[PDB]
């Protein structure tokens, strides 16, 4: 009936003066836009049908055409920034916002999905959706005693759309919008659906990606523990975003960082630092480096959990990118750690795997490592031990790589290395 229509036909119908003809034609257009086989978004946009659809949104008297056009507009808005721009230019934002209140759950759900695609385009449309005031209508849809009573899919679209209202930066979402949304977001980070949980974490990970004041309004809601918990989840789709949020939170003040330490975070890393998925590792190691860059009592917490051996492990064999984060973790640690602690690090075998990395073709890491070395040597000369440290690095061929680097092209490199040699070698 309404399958495979030509854009030509779809136009004929939408332009006719028969509501039904139009509805039939709109359902037809919807189907075209709902195929994976590269759907005719541009042709439909070219036919000049968006303003027509946008108009059908208001046909309160004919719910089906509202739905059909809503779905059509949704897939067009799911395209390129330009395709999404087309929808916005058509006057759809306020229209879709009106449909949030639609008595037809399936129509408002489409309005939620559409505003989701629009806001997802970026800051500008995100803030435009916000200026038309979509947050209240949205948040209103989740104003129930028990979330479980809502339709599983209906709840996932809302969580996802809110997720995009938090997404992006430069500029970051409006502060009062974040504060308005956070309460509801927290209630979602406690729902049983693994999908709501994942998008919720993405939402929180976004919000925590920025200035410390931002991380604070999130940490201030006491979600950290709930995150550390989700950090132990089985479903990678949840663990990935949860680890990202925790990772961000520790890029803030030592007080905020302490929160995850108290939350129990550190206890989940032996697993995270040996995780089969490299990115979980890459991000877990990065997270570790931001913790080893904090207080000494916080460096102690890392030590007490027996994570130093894990870092040694990552520093030894892992993806290069993971090893670079390890390099930092180790370099940050030796940066603010006590002598006693920098001693432990070497007693764990950090020296050998550290030298071997002085072979990679990445001037920056070669820096970070040498950097860590002088740090270590420094704590050594406080124990006169230096010579042992020398012997040691010489034992595993580190001296060769250093005295070699001494003749590197980067100015800083050959300089730090050259000094190491004279001041501590051969």
């Amino acid at each position: 009936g309404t399958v495979n229509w030509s854009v030509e036909d779809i136009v004929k119908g939408i332009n006719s003066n028969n509501l039904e003809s139009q509805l039939q034609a709109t359902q037809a257009a919807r189907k075209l836009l709902s195929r994976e086989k590269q759907p005719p978004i541009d042709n439909i946009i070219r036919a000049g049908l968006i303003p027509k659809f946008v108009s059908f949104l208001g046909k309160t008297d004919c719910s089906p055409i509202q739905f059909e056009s809503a779905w059509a507009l949704t897939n067009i808005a799911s395209g390129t920034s330009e395709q999404t721009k087309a929808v916005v230019d058509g006057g759809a934002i306020p229209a879709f916002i009106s449909l949030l209140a639609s008595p037809h759950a399936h129509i408002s759900e489409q309005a939620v999905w559409a505003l989701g695609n629009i806001a997802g385009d970026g800051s500008a449309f995100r803030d435009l959706v916000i200026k038309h005031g979509a947050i209240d209508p949205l948040l209103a849809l989740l104003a129930v005693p028990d979330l479980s009573t809502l339709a599983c899919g209906y709840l996932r679209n809302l969580t996802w759309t809110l997720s995009n209202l938090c997404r992006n930066k430069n500029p970051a979402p409006p502060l009062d919008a974040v504060e308005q949304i956070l309460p509801t977001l927290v209630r979602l980070l406690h729902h049983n659906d693994p999908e709501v949980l994942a998008d919720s974490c993405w939402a929180i990970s976004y919000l925590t990606d920025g200035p410390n004041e931002r991380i604070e309004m999130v940490v201030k809601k006491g979600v950290v523990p709930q995150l550390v918990k989700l950090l132990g989840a089985t479903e990678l789709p949840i663990v990935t975003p949860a680890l990202r949020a925790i990772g961000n939170i520790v890029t803030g003040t030592d007080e905020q960082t302490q929160k995850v330490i108290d939350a129990g975070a550190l206890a989940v890393f032996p697993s995270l630092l040996t995780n089969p998925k490299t990115n979980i590792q890459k991000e877990a190691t990065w997270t570790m480096s931001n913790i080893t860059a904090g207080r000494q009592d916080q460096i102690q917490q890392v030590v007490n959990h027996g994570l130093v051996p894990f870092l040694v492990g990552v520093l030894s064999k892992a993806d290069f990118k993971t090893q670079k984060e390890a390099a930092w973790a180790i370099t940050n640690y030796t940066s603010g750690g006590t002598v006693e602690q920098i001693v432990y690090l070497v007693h764990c075998g950090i020296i050998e795997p550290l030298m071997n990395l002085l072979s990679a073709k990445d001037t920056k890491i070669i820096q970070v490592i040498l950097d860590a070395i002088s740090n270590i040597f420094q704590a050594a000369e406080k124990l006169g031990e230096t010579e042992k440290l020398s012997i040691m690095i010489e034992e595993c061929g580190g001296l060769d790589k250093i005295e070699a680097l001494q003749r590197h092209e980067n100015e800083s490199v050959y300089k730090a290395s050259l000094n190491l040699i004279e001041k501590y070698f051969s």
Partner: peptide, 16 residues
């Protein structure tokens, strides 16, 4: 002390 970019996050938009 230092944060970076992403392993693409973002399915910004969803179809049908």
């Amino acid at each position: 002390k230092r944060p970076a970019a992403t392993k693409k996050a973002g399915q910004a938009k969803k179809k049908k």
